Amino acid sequence: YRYTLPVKAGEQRLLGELTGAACATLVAEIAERHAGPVVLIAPDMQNALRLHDEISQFTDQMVMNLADWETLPYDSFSPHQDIISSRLSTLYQLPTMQRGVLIVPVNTLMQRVCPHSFLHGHALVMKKGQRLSRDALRTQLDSAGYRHVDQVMEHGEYATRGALLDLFPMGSELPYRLDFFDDEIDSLRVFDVDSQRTLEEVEAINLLPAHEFPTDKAAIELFRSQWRDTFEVKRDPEHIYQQVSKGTLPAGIEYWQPLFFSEPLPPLFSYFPANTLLVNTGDLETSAERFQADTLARFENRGVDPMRPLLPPQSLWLRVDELFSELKNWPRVQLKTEHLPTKAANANLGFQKLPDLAVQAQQKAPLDALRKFLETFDGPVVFSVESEGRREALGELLARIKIAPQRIMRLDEASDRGRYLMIGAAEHGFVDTVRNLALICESDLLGERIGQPVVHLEHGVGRYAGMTTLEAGGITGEYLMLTYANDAKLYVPVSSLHLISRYAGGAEENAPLHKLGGDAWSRARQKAAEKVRDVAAELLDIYAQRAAKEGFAFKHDREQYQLFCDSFPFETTPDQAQAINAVLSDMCQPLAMDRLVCGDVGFGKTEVAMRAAFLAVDNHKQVAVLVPTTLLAQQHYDNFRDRFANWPVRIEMISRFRSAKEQTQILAEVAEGKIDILIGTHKLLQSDVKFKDLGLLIVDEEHRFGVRHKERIKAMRANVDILTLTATPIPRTLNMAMSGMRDLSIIATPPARRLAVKTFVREYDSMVVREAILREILRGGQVYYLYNDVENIQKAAERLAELVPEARIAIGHGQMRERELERVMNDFHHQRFNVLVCTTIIETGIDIPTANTIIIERADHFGLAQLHQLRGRVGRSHHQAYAWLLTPHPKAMTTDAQKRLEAIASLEDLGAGFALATHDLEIRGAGELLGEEQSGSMETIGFSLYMELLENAVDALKAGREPSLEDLTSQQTEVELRMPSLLPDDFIPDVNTRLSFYKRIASAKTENELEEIKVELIDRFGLLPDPARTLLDIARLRQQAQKLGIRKLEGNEKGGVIEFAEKNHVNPAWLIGLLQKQPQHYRLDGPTRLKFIQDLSERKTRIEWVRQFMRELEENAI
DNA sequence: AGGATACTTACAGCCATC
DNA sequence: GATGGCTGTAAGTATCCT
C-alpha cells in the first residue's frame, strides 16, 4: 500500500524514480489491485519479449502478448500463419477474459484491426457432442478457407482417408486427427505428422475462423469491385490485383485486406472493458511520429511499381492525433525512471542506483566488493536464479564467501539482510528505500560469456554392445560393452572415453580386429610417424614458402567503413564479426592473404567478403571472380552496386553476351584499370586476363573440372596474392593442408534465419508433386525441377503446365539465349510467371528469397557433384522451407541411389556435424588417395590418429622433434576413490545419450566446460543425484592434476596411494613440513609414491578433504 | 580400359549495313 | 557491292561416370 492508481478516464497518475522489472512486477501487483485486466505499451518487441518471463517470475497471474506482423509498411515480405494464430488467440480472449493481462507495442496498435467481423464470422470452439456432419464442416471450412489435399502441413488445407478427414488447427500449434465414425463418433485426438502418431485425447476443438480473413466468391468479387472503386489497372494478367481477381494468392497481399471495408478499425481500445488501463514507456508520441515518417517515406520512395498499388497510410492505419484522442477514454501508468517535479499525479517511487560491481579475475578478493557492502545495509538478497545449474554454481561460489541462501519464492517479506533466492532473468537492477534492498545477480557483476563399429587405441577395433552395470570390487561398476575378437566382451571404463574414436573407416574391413596388444595396432603409431615424416615435410615446405608472401599497408579509416557498412540489414551474427575481423586483420596484416571458408550460396553466407570491396578502394586496386555463370554474376553485380552505390564504384563484367563489342569494353576497362572488378564466365580464364593493380580475389566451385584452373591462377599471382574458399569443398585432405597452408574462417552462420526446412523423398507421381505445388503456390512460392536439357524439356513443361492448368510455369530451358535467360531472371525478380524450374550445370546456381521449396525428378539419374552442389543452392528467410524428391522404385535404383539415400537420411540440419555428414559420405565415397599412403591407414586405424599425427607433426615441426612421442604408452593421469558412483539410468534408457555425455565429459578439461555441461544436464534432466556429481569432481581434480601432470591415485577410507608427478613444479618444503606434521596421512613410499590414510566416513567427507587439499596443494604443491 | 557424354574454336552459310 | 558476321553444326576436347 501507500501507492495509488488512476480510476477515471484520462487520469494520468504518473510515476517517477522507477526501475526495470521492479516496477513491472509492481504493476503486476496492481493487477491484483485492479478490477479486471489491463494492457501496456511496448516501445518495441524485444523489451516486452523479455519482460513476459521477467514478471512471470514474480506473479501468480498470467499475461501474454500478440505476435507482431514481422513485415514492414510497404515491404514485400509477408507474415506467417503462426504469428497470426497467436494474434487471434490473444484477441478473441478479450471478450472472454476477466483477469490476467495482455501487452502490445507502439507499432501493431497503430495497425488497424481485422476485427471480430472475423470472430463474428464464427464458428468457434466445439466438441464431438452433436449429431454432426463433416461435409457440413468442410463447407464451413471453405467458408473459413481451408481446402483439400492428400496430405497437409499448414493451415488452409486438409486430407481425407476413406472418408475420415483431418486438418491443422490454428489457435493450437498441434496437428489434429479427427476420428470420424458415421455420426457415432467416440474420440478426437491430437496428432503429429513427423510423428505419424495420434497423441493426446481432447475434450474440445477451437473452430475459430480459420484464415487471416474468410474470403469467398462474393468477398472476392467485392474486393475486385472495391479496387475498381478506388482505382483502375490494366488487363495484364500478372498484376497482383488482376491475379487475385483470377482467384489467387501472392504473399504481401495481406497488406490490402485492411482496406477490405470502408469502416476502419482503429486500435483495440474499442474492445476492452471500461476498467482496463494504459501504460507509458519512452515516447509513444515520437516513436509513432517517426513510425509515420518511415511508413510514408517507404510509401513515396517505393510508390513506383505499376503492379503494386501503394496506398493511403491514413486509410490503412492511424495517427497519433486520434490515437491519444481515443485513449483519452482511459487512464494510464506513466512511467519513467527518474525524480521529477512536484505534482500530485507524480510518484517518485523510492528507488536508487545499484553500485558498480567490478570483480576482476586478476585480483585476490575482488569478490568481496559485495560482501563489504553487505554489512552496511539491511538489504536481503532474495535474488535471481536463471537455472538449476545456475543455482548449483551460484551456491558453490557463495560457499566461496561462506553464505548459502535458502531459496524463497516470495518477494518482499524476507528478513533484513535475509539470505534467500528465487528465479530471475534480467540484467540491470537498482536499489530500494521503501523496502531497502536491491535486485541483482552476476549479470550486473560480469554479465555472461547404433549398429556401430568403433576404434580404440590400446586394444584395437570393435563394435557396439551397450554398457555393463556391475558391482566392482567392493563398489559399483558401470562400464561400456564393446564387441570384438572371439566375442571379446570388453567391459570398459567410461572415464576412458576420450581415448576411443568412431569406426573412422570404410565398412569393408577397416575395423578388422585386434588380438594381443603389441602388434600392428600399435604400428598404427609407426605409420603415424611416417605420415609425420612425409606429409609433415610437405607442410614444412608449404609454410616455409606459402607463409611469407608479403603485401602492403592497409590503413583502416574505420569511420568510412562502417558508414558504408551500417547498411547491412542482417543485424549481424557476431560470428560473422569474427569472420570479418579476422580476415581484415589478414588484410591489414601486410603479409600473405589466405583464409579458407565454407558456407552456403544461401544469402548471408555469400556477401560478407564484399566488405573487402571497401578495402579494395583505399588501396585503389582490382578484384574479380569467376562466377561460373553469368546469372549469379549480374546478381552479384546488382546487389553490389545497390549496396556499394554512391561513390567511385565502376564495374563491368563478362557475360554470355560477350560480343566483340563487349570484348572491346573489356579491353577498355582492363586496360583502363580505373575500373574496379570483372566477373567471369565459363570461357574466362586462359584469356590473357589483364591487371595493373590487383588487390585480391574470391571464387568457388571448381568441382567437376580439373584443378587445371587452380594451378593456372597459380600462374596469375605476379608479386600478388589470393583469398578464396569454397562452400562445399572436397575431403579436407587438401583443406587440411590448408590447416597448414591457408587458415580458415568457416564460421558460416548457423543462426539468424534458422527456420523450418522440410526435405523428404517419395516416389514418382503426378498428384504428390501437385500437392507440393499446392503447398508453394499459395503465396507464389517456388520449387525447381530438372531435365537433361537434351530431350523434350518442353514436353516436361507441357506435362507440368498441364497438371497445373492454372499457374504460369516458364521456359527454364538451359542452352538457349543468354538474352532469354536474362528475361527469365527478370521474371524471377518479378514472377510474371508465378512458377519456373531449373536443371543442370549450366542452369542451377543459387537460392532465392521468394522461393520456398525444390524437388528432384531423377535422383535415379544423378551424381556426385549433383548432390554436393544442390546442397548449396537452397535457402529462405523467416518462413517455412521445404523440399521433396522423386524416385522410381529402389528395386530399379542401384547401390548409388542407396548411397545417396543414406545421404538423404543423413540430411537433418546444419547442426554440429554437417561436415561430419559429408565426411561419412566420403567414406561412403571411399575412393580417396589424397593422403595416398595415409588414406588406407587412417581408414584402417582412424582419422582420430590423423588429427593426432597432424597436431604432433605440426607442433614438433615448429619444435623440430618430429617422429614419435605420442603419449601413446601413457597420456592419462589416473585416479580412484572407492566410490559406488557413476551415471544413473534414472533419467534415460538410451546409452548413446550416455555416450554423448561421456563425449562432452572425457573431452572436457576446463571449469567452464564442466560447469556448462552441468547446467545443461541438470536443467534438461533435473537435479540428478550425487554420484555423477562425484564423477565431475573427479573430472575437475583431473583438470588440475593433469595441468600439473600427476600420475595416479587410488583412494578409499581404508586409505590409498598416489603415484605423484615425478615431473611437476615441485619444491619439497611442503614435503618435509608434512613429514614434521603428518607421517600417517602422508607416508611417502620411498621417494617414489605416497600412501595415505583417512577415516573420512562419508563420501562427502572424502571429496571435501580432496577439494580442500587440492587447493592446499595448489597454493603449495605444484 | 576406356567411354558416354558435356565445353569450346573453327567452317561456313545468308542475309544485313553501308 | 561486297564483305562479313553472327549464328548454327560439328570436330577436338576433356567432363560426366557409372
Numbering used by the authors: 5 to 453, 479 to 1147
Could you give the paper's own sentences about this structure?
Transcription-repair coupling factors (TRCFs) are large superfamily 2 ATPases that mediate the preferential repair of the transcribed DNA strand (aka transcription-coupled DNA repair, TCR) in organisms ranging from bacteria to humans. At its core, TCR appears universally conserved, and relies on (1) the ability of transcription-repair coupling ATPases to release damage-stalled RNA polymerases (RNAPs) off the nucleic-acid template owing to ATP-driven translocation on dsDNA upstream of the transcription bubble, and (2) on their ability to recruit nucleotide excision repair (NER) machinery. In bacteria, a single protein, Mfd (aka TRCF) is necessary and sufficient for the coupling process. Mfd translocation on dsDNA is central to all Mfd functions.
Our observation that ADP•AlFx enhances the affinity for DNA allowed us to reconstitute stable Mfd-DNA complexes, and prepare specimens suitable for single-particle cryo-EM for structure determination. For our DNA substrate, we chose a 21mer blunt dsDNA fragment, consistent with previously determined Mfd footprints of ~26bp16,26,29. We thus acquired images at 30° tilts, which allowed us to obtain a more isotropic map resolved to 5.5 Å. This enabled us to readily dock all the individual domains of Mfd31 into the map and perform real-space refinement to obtain the final model. At this resolution, we do not observe density that can be assigned to the transition state analog moiety. First, our reconstruction reveals an unexpected large-scale swiveling motion of the UvrB homology module (D1a-D2-D1b), which results in a ~49 Å displacement and an 82° rotation of D2. Second, particularly striking is the repositioning of domain of unknown function D3, which swings from the ventral side laterally toward D7 upon DNA binding, establishing new bridging interactions with the UvrB homology module and D7. In contrast, when Mfd is bound to DNA, D3 makes contacts with D1a and D7, swapping position with D2. The UvrA-binding surface on D2, including residues critical for binding such as R165 and R18129 becomes fully exposed. In our reconstruction, the two helices of the TRG snap together and are likely stabilized by ADP•AlFx. binding.
